[PDB]
Amino acid sequence: KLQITLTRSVIGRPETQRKTVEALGLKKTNSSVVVEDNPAIRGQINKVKHLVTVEE
Amino acid sequence: SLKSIIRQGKQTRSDLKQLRKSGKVPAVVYGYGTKNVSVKVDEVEFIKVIREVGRNGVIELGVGSKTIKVMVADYQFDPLKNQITHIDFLAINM
Amino acid sequence: TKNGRDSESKRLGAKRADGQFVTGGSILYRQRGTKIYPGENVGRGGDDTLFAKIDGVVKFERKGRDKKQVSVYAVA
Amino acid sequence: LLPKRVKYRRQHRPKTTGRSKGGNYVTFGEFGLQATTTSWITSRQIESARIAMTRYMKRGGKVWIKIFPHTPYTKKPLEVRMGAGKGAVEGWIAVVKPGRILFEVAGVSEEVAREALRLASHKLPVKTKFVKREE
Amino acid sequence: AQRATKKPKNLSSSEGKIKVTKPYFASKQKKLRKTVKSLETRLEKLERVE
RNA sequence: UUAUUGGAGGUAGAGCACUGUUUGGACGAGGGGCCCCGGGUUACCGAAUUCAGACAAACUCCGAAUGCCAAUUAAUUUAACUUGGGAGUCAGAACAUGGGUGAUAAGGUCCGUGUUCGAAAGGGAAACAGCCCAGACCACCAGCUAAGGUCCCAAAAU
RNA sequence: UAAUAGCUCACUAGUCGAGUGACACUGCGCCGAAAAUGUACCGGGGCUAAACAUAUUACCGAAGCUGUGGAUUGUCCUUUG
RNA sequence: CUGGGGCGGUCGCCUCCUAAAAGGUAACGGAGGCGCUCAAAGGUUCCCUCAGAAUGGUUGGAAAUCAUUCAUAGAGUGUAA
RNA sequence: UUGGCACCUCGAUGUCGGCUCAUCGCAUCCUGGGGCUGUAGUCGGUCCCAAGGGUUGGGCUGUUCGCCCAUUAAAGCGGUA
RNA sequence: CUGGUGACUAUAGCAAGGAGGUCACACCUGUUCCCAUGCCGAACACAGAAGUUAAGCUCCUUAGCGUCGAUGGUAGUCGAACUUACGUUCCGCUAGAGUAGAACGUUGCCAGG
Numbered sequence: 001k002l003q004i005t006l007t008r009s010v011i012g013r014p015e016t017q018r019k020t021v022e023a024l025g026l027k028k029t030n031s032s033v034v035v036e037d038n039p040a041i042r043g044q045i046n047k048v049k050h051l052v053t054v055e056e
Numbered sequence: 057s058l059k060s061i062i063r064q065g066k067q068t069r070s071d072l073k074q075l076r077k078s079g080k081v082p083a084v085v086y087g088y089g090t091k092n093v094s095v096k097v098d099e100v101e102f103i104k105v106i107r108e109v110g111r112n113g114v115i116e117l118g119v120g121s122k123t124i125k126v127m128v129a130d131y132q133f134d135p136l137k138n139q140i141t142h143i144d145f146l147a148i149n150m
Numbered sequence: 151t152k153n154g155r156d157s158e159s160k161r162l163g164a165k166r167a168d169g170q171f172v173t174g175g176s177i178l179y180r181q182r183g184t185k186i187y188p189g190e191n192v193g194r195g196g197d198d199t200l201f202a203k204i205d206g207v208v209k210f211e212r213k214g215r216d217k218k219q220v221s222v223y224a225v226a
Numbered sequence: 227l228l229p230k231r232v233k234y235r236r237q238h239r240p241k242t243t244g245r246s247k248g249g250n251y252v253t254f255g256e257f258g259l260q261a262t263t264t265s266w267i268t269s270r271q272i273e274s275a276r277i278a279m280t281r282y283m284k285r286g287g288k289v290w291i292k293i294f295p296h297t298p299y300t301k302k303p304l305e306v307r308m309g310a311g312k313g314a315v316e317g318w319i320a321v322v323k324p325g326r327i328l329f330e331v332a333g334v335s336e337e338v339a340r341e342a343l344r345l346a347s348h349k350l351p352v353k354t355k356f357v358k359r360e361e
Numbered sequence: 362a363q364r365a366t367k368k369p370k371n372l373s374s375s376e377g378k379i380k381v382t383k384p385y386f387a388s389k390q391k392k393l394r395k396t397v398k399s400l401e402t403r404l405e406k407l408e409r410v411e
Numbered sequence: 412u413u414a415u416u417g418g419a420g421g422u423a424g425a426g427c428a429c430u431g432u433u434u435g436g437a438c439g440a441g442g443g444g445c446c447c448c449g450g451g452u453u454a455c456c457g458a459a460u461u462c463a464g465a466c467a468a469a470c471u472c473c474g475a476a477u478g479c480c481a482a483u484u485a486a487u488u489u490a491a492c493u494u495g496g497g498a499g500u501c502a503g504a505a506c507a508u509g510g511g512u513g514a515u516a517a518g519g520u521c522c523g524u525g526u527u528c529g530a531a532a533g534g535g536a537a538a539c540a541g542c543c544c545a546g547a548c549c550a551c552c553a554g555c556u557a558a559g560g561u562c563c564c565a566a567a568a569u
Numbered sequence: 570u571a572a573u574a575g576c577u578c579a580c581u582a583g584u585c586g587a588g589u590g591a592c593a594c595u596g597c598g599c600c601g602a603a604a605a606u607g608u609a610c611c612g613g614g615g616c617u618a619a620a621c622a623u624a625u626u627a628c629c630g631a632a633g634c635u636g637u638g639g640a641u642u643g644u645c646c647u648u649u650g
Numbered sequence: 651c652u653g654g655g656g657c658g659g660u661c662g663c664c665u666c667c668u669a670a671a672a673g674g675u676a677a678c679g680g681a682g683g684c685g686c687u688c689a690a691a692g693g694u695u696c697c698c699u700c701a702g703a704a705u706g707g708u709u710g711g712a713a714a715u716c717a718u719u720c721a722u723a724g725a726g727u728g729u730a731a
Numbered sequence: 732u733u734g735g736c737a738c739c740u741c742g743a744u745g746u747c748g749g750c751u752c753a754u755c756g757c758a759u760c761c762u763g764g765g766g767c768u769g770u771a772g773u774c775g776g777u778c779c780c781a782a783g784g785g786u787u788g789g790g791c792u793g794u795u796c797g798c799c800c801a802u803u804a805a806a807g808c809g810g811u812a
Numbered sequence: 813c814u815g816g817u818g819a820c821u822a823u824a825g826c827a828a829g830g831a832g833g834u835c836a837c838a839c840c841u842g843u844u845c846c847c848a849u850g851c852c853g854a855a856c857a858c859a860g861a862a863g864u865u866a867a868g869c870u871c872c873u874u875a876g877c878g879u880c881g882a883u884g885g886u887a888g889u890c891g892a893a894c895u896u897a898c899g900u901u902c903c904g905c906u907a908g909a910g911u912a913g914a915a916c917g918u919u920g921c922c923a924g925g
């Protein structure tokens with residue numbers, strides 16, 4: 001289980017990445033979201049890891 | 057006709073690049089005996105041994121277990137840079 | 151100059167993917183010649199289109215290394 | 227230096243990024259010339275360089291050019307607004323990427339070879355270096 | 362019409378560097394070529410006969 | 412949207428297995444100029460064969476990553492379609508990338524992809540629509556940071 | 570020089586009293602470098618670091634985020650908030 | 651229509667490439683065809699498998715036709731690719 | 732310079748030469764300072780520094796250019812819509 | 813084991829050498845009627861079994877050609893960070909060629925022994 005913070009904006013980032021952000025549940029910058037460690041969500045990490053900071 | 061050797065686990069285009077910058081060449085050893093090993097060897101030692109015992113002389117390779125009798129089936133060499141990039145050691149029959 | 155023309159494109163290729171459910175008479179793969187052959191419950195039209203004849207499920211397949219085929223298999 | 231016949235006289239102009247698909251290891255002769263940089267090379271440059279080497283060396287000597295300009299290139303007529311097709315041919319080019327061997331030379335000593343290929347290097351648009359064979 | 366656009370002979374620096382009159386001459390060339398179009402039209406309007 | 416599975420497709424690369432191009436050799440298949448029916452040649456070599464090295468948008472024995480199409484699957488998300496009322500838009504621009512044209516020129520032109528501008532203010536780039544950071548309901552003599560920076564102009568390390 | 574001739578270099582021997590060369594890959598830099606109103610491509614002062622590279626710690630810094638209060642429109646709770 | 655207009659060229663359809671491995675994708679970007687033909691060159695049933703080279707052989711590239719062997723496709727597929 | 736682009740200007744940015752008045756650049760025509768010379772000397776060739784000042788009057792042509800007469804230390808190349 | 817007949821990407825094939833036969837299959841004897849060849853019983857088809865393993869067929873061995881083919885490394889590349897350099901740096905995938913090597917087929921149903 002882990003929390004996921006959107007530390008870095010989506011202005012200037014493609015719509016793929018923006019979509020993963022919405023799917024994760026991140027809506028503003030420096031917003032956090034707690035989820036489980038599905039590999040389905042590890043892929044959502046890896047698409048946007050440069051936008052994101054994860055903590056466990 | 058001797059090379060001391062290290063074994064390498066998995067590698068990337070930064071670990072491998074740092075080795076081959078340091079002057080250590082990657083290689084494999086496969087053939088008649090053991091199954092297969094991925095190794096580091098020293099570029100300078102390898103050069104000296106080949107200038108000594110020929111393009112196809114026989115070599116004793118101290119992988120970390122006992123020495124293995126090998127020869128060079130193929131070498132990937134980098135022109136514009138003048139250094140060896142990968143080596144294939146064919147562990148020969150007896 | 152002596153050039154500057156080209157014809158309309160014809161929208162060739164696959165039109166229903168593999169592992170997909172398909173009704174009768176459904177186009178699968180428009181083409182020119184047997185780029186892909188038929189298989190089971192598939193017919194080849196005059197212009198070499200490939201159409202299902204029965205409802206079922208699509209599976210593109212092998213027919214010997216330079217030859218594919220396509221089969222619409224029933225389901226239950 | 228030209229091809230005798232080609233199917234398409236108006237080609238796209240080639241790619242210049244990357245490195246050699248081949249022609250890197252000196253094969254025929256003893257010494258060679260190796261590009262450190264990328265550019266195009268023409269019939270004209272090749273004739274000049276080859277003349278330079280063959281004059282610097284006596285009749286004792288053997289040269290192997292290792293490139294050929296297959297690819298033509300265009301230039302429009304002068305004082306012409308853009309568009310309206312594609313221009314006629316005015317030359318033929320071999321692309322060169324770093325690594326590739328341009329000239330190889332056999333029948334001499336390394337000093338003579340160095341000076342000849344030095345003289346030739348100044349007649350190409352490319353930085354070169356001098357190569358010997360391998361192991 | 363082709364002559365209409367090309368510079369004359371022995372026209373020096375100031376006259377050659379003049380560059381404002383290009384449209385004048387281009388329009389004169391269009392006029393003469395329009396006339397060739399008229400004649401070609403007449404030629405087509407001729408009653409062909411075999 | 413991702414994970415997984417499957418699938419179509421022939422790109423970058425690479426390669427010469429066909430199509431065309433091409434280097435240097437070994438033979439040659441027999442011609443040609445010239446000498447006297449035949450026989451010669453410091454020569455073209457049309458070719459055939461073969462060894463080695465090379466070229467390709469309209470060559471491919473081969474063949475990626477990506478992207479795409481779906482799934483009796485799982486997770487996260489919150490949109491999608493239909494019917495009707497009402498519109499506006501059909502001059503687009505720069506930047507990055509893949510490519511054409513051009514001169515591997517243009518703040519060039521035309522396409523693909525993406526972002527921004529348009530329609531978007533704020534901080535940096537001296538100033539500077541499109542670059543980088545970032546998306547303003549309002550107030551606050553409160554705080555943490557980004558990009559970018561810390562000698563003075565000019566806030567923060569001489 | 571007219572050939573001569575003159576004179577040197579190589580090649581060596583003698584003094585010394587420690588280093589001395591030639592090959593290659595690299596980093597940073599040097600000239601190449603001449604334009605028209607006025608220094609005139611660090612923004613300026615000015616800097617031999619106040620530059621460059623590498624590593625680290627602090628900090629400033631937006632109308633971003635947070636804190637506090639207020640308006641509006643929705644959703645969940647909720648009688649009332 | 652158009653890298654001003656004009657001349658030149660083009661206007662509809664088909665096939666390649668540009669076209670960036672779905673599809674689609676522009677330019678006065680590059681190469682070519684079409685405005686038909688076939689009562690069989692259609693339908694069906696039976697059977698057959700080519701081109702090219704070497705060799706042998708009259709009128710001789712033995713290229714006409716023949717015989718054999720090789721040859722998996724380089725022939726042919728009415729007609730562009 | 733001949734060109735490409737077509738970003739500014741279409742509810743107006745007025746052409747060529749000449750006259751008047753200058754100004755900057757230097758890739759220096761002269762004068763100045765030097766190296767080399769295949770510089771004996773006078774004259775020259777060439778190249779480096781140098782932009783302080785100076786740098787002609789007429790004939791033809793609307794002409795700039797150009798040719799010519801006669802001089803001059805020299806009869807400069809260009810930017811400034 | 814032989815034969816018939818399907819299935820699998822030639823790992824199955826090509827090539828060379830060798831071997832066997834009246835129980836199969838073959839070649840083989842002839843045109844007798846069915847039937848047939850831009851001409852011939854070569855082929856097709858039929859009445860056959862005197863004859864022969866030569867050939868086709870099948871079996872054994874060999875890795876010369878073909879086919880398949882890792883690991884490792886490389887080119888390339890989605891994405892990200894720097895910068896405009898015919899680019900670099902990090903991650904993930906991942907060739908092609910080749911190298912070692914695999915392989916001179918394996919099964920399924922049926923009739924015979």
Ligand SMILES: [K+]
Pocket residue numbers: 347348349350351352353
């Ligand atoms: K050069």
Ligand SMILES: [K+]
Pocket residue numbers: none
């Ligand atoms: K927007």
Ligand SMILES: [K+]
Pocket residue numbers: 740741
């Ligand atoms: K105007």
Ligand SMILES: [Mg+2]
Pocket residue numbers: 196197
């Ligand atoms: Mg039809």
Ligand SMILES: [Mg+2]
Pocket residue numbers: none
């Ligand atoms: Mg390619």
Ligand SMILES: [Mg+2]
Pocket residue numbers: none
């Ligand atoms: Mg290609």
Ligand SMILES: [Mg+2]
Pocket residue numbers: none
């Ligand atoms: Mg533009």
Ligand SMILES: [Mg+2]
Pocket residue numbers: 529
């Ligand atoms: Mg607008």
Ligand SMILES: [Mg+2]
Pocket residue numbers: none
């Ligand atoms: Mg803004």
Ligand SMILES: [Mg+2]
Pocket residue numbers: 555
């Ligand atoms: Mg702070």
Ligand SMILES: [Mg+2]
Pocket residue numbers: none
């Ligand atoms: Mg301060």
Ligand SMILES: [Mg+2]
Pocket residue numbers: 569
């Ligand atoms: Mg300090």
Ligand SMILES: [Mg+2]
Pocket residue numbers: none
């Ligand atoms: Mg806010």
Ligand SMILES: [Mg+2]
Pocket residue numbers: none
């Ligand atoms: Mg035009």
Ligand SMILES: [Mg+2]
Pocket residue numbers: 653737
């Ligand atoms: Mg224009």
Ligand SMILES: [Mg+2]
Pocket residue numbers: none
């Ligand atoms: Mg496509």
